[PDB]
Amino acid sequence: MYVYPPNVESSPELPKHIYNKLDKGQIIVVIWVIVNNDKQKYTLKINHDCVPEQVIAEAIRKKTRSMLLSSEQLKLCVLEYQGKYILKVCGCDEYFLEKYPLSQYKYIRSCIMLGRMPNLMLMAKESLYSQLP
């Protein structure tokens, strides 16, 4: 399947009416995973200008909390695993595959403007791969 380029606004600066809806610079996002095809979710508070791999890193921080990792161990774990996953907008064929502040992706900026909760699916990066012809 082909993969579209990031669906982003032209600049990372927020228009003032959107900036002023931030909560101390932060937003809340819901991250879903398929585990049976049963679903599980995390709800995470993040800086609005976190890039997609930093969202994945924060999910890794939550998933590994019971391991009582040091910061150095968590960094090692994040470096090993964050690149194995990708974020997709729930309900459509749009992914967050490049380094932009999350609030520059049009879906997220729209969610902030509307006071809607972004819902994202965390998937294996291999789900994107095409077979060579």
- Indicate the residue among 63 and 84 with the shorter CB distance to Mg ion: 63
Using rule CB under 5 A, residue 43 touches Mg ion: yes
Tell whether residue 42 is a contact of Mg ion (CB under 5 A).
Answer: yes
Q: From the CB of 77, what's the least distance to Mg ion, in Å? A: 19
Which backbone phi and psi does 20 adopt, to 5 degrees? -75, -10
Q: Which is nearer to Mg ion, 26 or 76 (CB)?
A: 26
Binding site for ligand A1ATF (CB under 6 A): 31, 33, 35, 40-42, 56, 59-60, 63, 85, 122
